[PDB]
Design an enzyme around this catalytic site. Structure first.
Site, PDB file in Angstrom:
ATOM      1  N   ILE A  22      -3.599  -0.653  -4.636  1.00  0.00           N
ATOM      2  CA  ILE A  22      -3.599  -1.702  -3.675  1.00  0.00           C
ATOM      3  C   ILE A  22      -2.894  -1.759  -1.908  1.00  0.00           C
ATOM      4  O   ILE A  22      -2.752  -2.446  -1.481  1.00  0.00           O
ATOM      5  CB  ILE A  22      -2.613  -2.650  -4.446  1.00  0.00           C
ATOM      6  N   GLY A  24      -2.801   1.871   0.994  1.00  0.00           N
ATOM      7  CA  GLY A  24      -3.798   3.204   1.543  1.00  0.00           C
ATOM      8  C   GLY A  24      -3.824   3.498   3.288  1.00  0.00           C
ATOM      9  O   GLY A  24      -3.749   4.141   3.628  1.00  0.00           O
ATOM     10  N   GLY A  26      -0.581   4.015   6.498  1.00  0.00           N
ATOM     11  CA  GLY A  26       0.658   5.198   6.658  1.00  0.00           C
ATOM     12  C   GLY A  26       0.023   6.375   6.153  1.00  0.00           C
ATOM     13  O   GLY A  26      -1.029   6.747   6.358  1.00  0.00           O
ATOM     14  N   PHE A  27       0.607   6.859   5.442  1.00  0.00           N
ATOM     15  CA  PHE A  27      -0.127   8.259   4.827  1.00  0.00           C
ATOM     16  C   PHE A  27       0.373   8.812   3.323  1.00  0.00           C
ATOM     17  O   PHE A  27       1.287   9.678   3.192  1.00  0.00           O
ATOM     18  CB  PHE A  27       2.486   8.845   5.361  1.00  0.00           C
ATOM     19  N   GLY A  28      -0.285   7.781   2.894  1.00  0.00           N
ATOM     20  CA  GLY A  28      -0.849   7.717   1.886  1.00  0.00           C
ATOM     21  C   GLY A  28      -1.715   6.093   0.649  1.00  0.00           C
ATOM     22  O   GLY A  28      -1.853   5.745   2.172  1.00  0.00           O
ATOM     23  N   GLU A  29      -1.248   6.527  -0.379  1.00  0.00           N
ATOM     24  CA  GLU A  29      -1.684   4.912  -1.055  1.00  0.00           C
ATOM     25  C   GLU A  29      -1.039   4.861  -1.906  1.00  0.00           C
ATOM     26  O   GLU A  29       0.325   5.848  -2.547  1.00  0.00           O
ATOM     27  CB  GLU A  29      -3.369   6.028  -1.930  1.00  0.00           C
ATOM     28  N   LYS A  45       3.297   5.317  -5.385  1.00  0.00           N
ATOM     29  CA  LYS A  45       3.204   5.700  -4.160  1.00  0.00           C
ATOM     30  C   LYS A  45       2.185   7.497  -4.485  1.00  0.00           C
ATOM     31  O   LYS A  45       3.173   8.196  -4.831  1.00  0.00           O
ATOM     32  CB  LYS A  45       4.158   5.845  -3.473  1.00  0.00           C
ATOM     33  N   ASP A 136      10.542   2.136  11.210  1.00  0.00           N
ATOM     34  CA  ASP A 136       8.899   1.758  11.369  1.00  0.00           C
ATOM     35  C   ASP A 136       9.390  -0.027  11.036  1.00  0.00           C
ATOM     36  O   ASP A 136       9.137  -0.752  10.118  1.00  0.00           O
ATOM     37  CB  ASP A 136       8.647   2.775   9.882  1.00  0.00           C
TER      38      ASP A 136
HETATM   39  C1  LIG Z   1      -0.401  -4.947   5.833  1.00  0.00           C
HETATM   40  C2  LIG Z   1      -0.888  -4.120   5.987  1.00  0.00           C
HETATM   41  C3  LIG Z   1      -0.808  -3.247   4.526  1.00  0.00           C
HETATM   42  C4  LIG Z   1      -0.726  -4.465   3.645  1.00  0.00           C
HETATM   43  O1  LIG Z   1      -0.607  -4.158   1.973  1.00  0.00           O
HETATM   44  C5  LIG Z   1       0.471  -3.958   1.634  1.00  0.00           C
HETATM   45  C6  LIG Z   1       0.118  -3.542  -0.031  1.00  0.00           C
HETATM   46  C7  LIG Z   1       1.433  -3.322  -0.657  1.00  0.00           C
HETATM   47  C8  LIG Z   1       2.859  -2.611  -0.159  1.00  0.00           C
HETATM   48  N1  LIG Z   1       3.745  -2.298  -0.475  1.00  0.00           N
HETATM   49  C9  LIG Z   1       4.103  -2.777  -1.933  1.00  0.00           C
HETATM   50  N2  LIG Z   1       3.835  -3.750  -2.271  1.00  0.00           N
HETATM   51  C10 LIG Z   1       3.868  -4.800  -3.358  1.00  0.00           C
HETATM   52  N3  LIG Z   1       5.404  -3.885  -4.360  1.00  0.00           N
HETATM   53  C11 LIG Z   1       5.615  -2.824  -4.008  1.00  0.00           C
HETATM   54  N4  LIG Z   1       6.359  -2.196  -4.153  1.00  0.00           N
HETATM   55  C12 LIG Z   1       7.165  -0.891  -3.440  1.00  0.00           C
HETATM   56  C13 LIG Z   1       6.245  -1.155  -1.904  1.00  0.00           C
HETATM   57  C14 LIG Z   1       5.573  -1.956  -2.815  1.00  0.00           C
HETATM   58  C15 LIG Z   1       2.609  -2.834   1.461  1.00  0.00           C
HETATM   59  C16 LIG Z   1       1.700  -3.395   1.881  1.00  0.00           C
HETATM   60  C17 LIG Z   1      -0.312  -5.605   3.808  1.00  0.00           C
HETATM   61  C18 LIG Z   1       0.101  -5.996   5.100  1.00  0.00           C
END
Ligand SMILES: c1ccc(Oc2ccc(Nc3ncnc4[nH]ccc34)cc2)cc1
Length: 294
Positions: A22, A24, A26-29, A45, A136
């Site tokens: 979902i 990718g 930052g510093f991982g996936e 993560k 951040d």
């Molecule tokens: C701009 C950049 C990236 C982007 O995609 C994301 C995908 C997942 C996430 N993280 C999460 N999402 C859903 N549940 C989550 N629980 C913990 C972290 C997390 C954050 C961003 C959206 C707009």
């Protein structure tokens, strides 16, 4: 190019079935996984065990310290092996960066802006209160919940770039002479641009920039790619110009955060009153539709 850190379909620790990638950046996936113990979808993560900068050790430390607090994901698990390190936590819903971009002109109303802003301030005071700086603060590190009971709650999603700023029993740690900034140019404070040690106030600068972008749809340095050119603009910029489209009490917010430095604890109650007073002046109630509902 390189494959995904995890193959979709694998089981992590005989418990978490990887379903789909979902994210990718930052510093991982990050993956949607099925937790076969609780029979629920979760966020997983991961980082390679070989990559130069690994931040999931910080993610786990801060997530654990914030359990019980508002605006944070429930901690579910973590581990380290020869191939990857991982952290498991509550899956949330729509990301604020995505929600803002879905608006006409990329703006939220003052109603949505004030309510999100106040929740985000709560989340900043919370992480500060357990002795960490976020460093951040940006819209893609926040999401609304994905259930009826959580979709009006905004969650701080990631702590990879955090730093512990207190030592012994909550003394502020002496700042380093130079601190190499690894956050996002668009929302970074002047201090990040100057490679100074960041403080509590630098997270509040980033919140101020996010709120202005919410109401205006853009920041003055939107089209400038060069980090040093962005920094030069911020150093000279009259931030009072950004008050034009915010409620009047944001002059108090901006004057307060302008007065702060690394060694000065924010007056969080003052900053909270700016949101509370603004929300009452504009007749905003919590049950009012957010912009993405209506
Ligand atoms: C701009 C950049 C990236 C982007 O995609 C994301 C995908 C997942 C996430 N993280 C999460 N999402 C859903 N549940 C989550 N629980 C913990 C972290 C997390 C954050 C961003 C959206 C707009």
């Amino acid at each position: 190019e390189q494959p995904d850190i995890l193959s979709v379909g694998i089981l992590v620790k005989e418990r978490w079935k990887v379903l789909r990638k979902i994210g990718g950046g930052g510093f991982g996936e990050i993956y949607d996984a099925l937790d076969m113990l609780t029979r629920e979808n979760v966020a997983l993560k991961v980082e390679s065990a070989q990559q130069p900068k690994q931040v999931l050790k910080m993610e786990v430390a801060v997530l654990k310290k914030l359990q019980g607090k508002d605006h944070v994901c429930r901690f579910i698990g973590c581990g380290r092996n020869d191939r990857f390190n991982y952290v498991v936590m509550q899956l949330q819903g729509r990301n604020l960066a995505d929600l803002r971009r879905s608006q006409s002109r990329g703006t939220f109303t003052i109603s949505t802006t004030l309510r999100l802003g106040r929740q985000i301030l709560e989340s900043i005071e919370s992480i500060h209160s357990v002795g960490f700086l976020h460093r951040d603060i940006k819209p893609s590190n926040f999401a609304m919940g994905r259930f009826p009971s959580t979709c009006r709650k905004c969650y701080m999603l990631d702590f990879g770039l955090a730093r512990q700023f207190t030592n012994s029993c909550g003394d502020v740690r002496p700042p380093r002479a130079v601190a190499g900034f690894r956050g996002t140019v668009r929302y970074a404070s002047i201090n990040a641009h100057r490679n100074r040690e960041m403080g509590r106030h630098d997270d509040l600068w980033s919140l101020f920039y996010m709120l202005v972008e919410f109401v205006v749809g853009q920041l003055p340095w939107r089209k400038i790619k060069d980090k040093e050119q962005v920094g030069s603009i911020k150093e000279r910029y009259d931030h009072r110009l950004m008050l034009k489209h915010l409620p009047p009490e944001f002059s108090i917010f901006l004057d307060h955060i302008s007065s702060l430095d690394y060694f000065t604890k924010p007056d969080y109650q003052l900053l909270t009153s700016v949101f509370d007073n603004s929300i009452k002046t504009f007749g905003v109630i919590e049950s009012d539709p957010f912009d993405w509902e209506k």
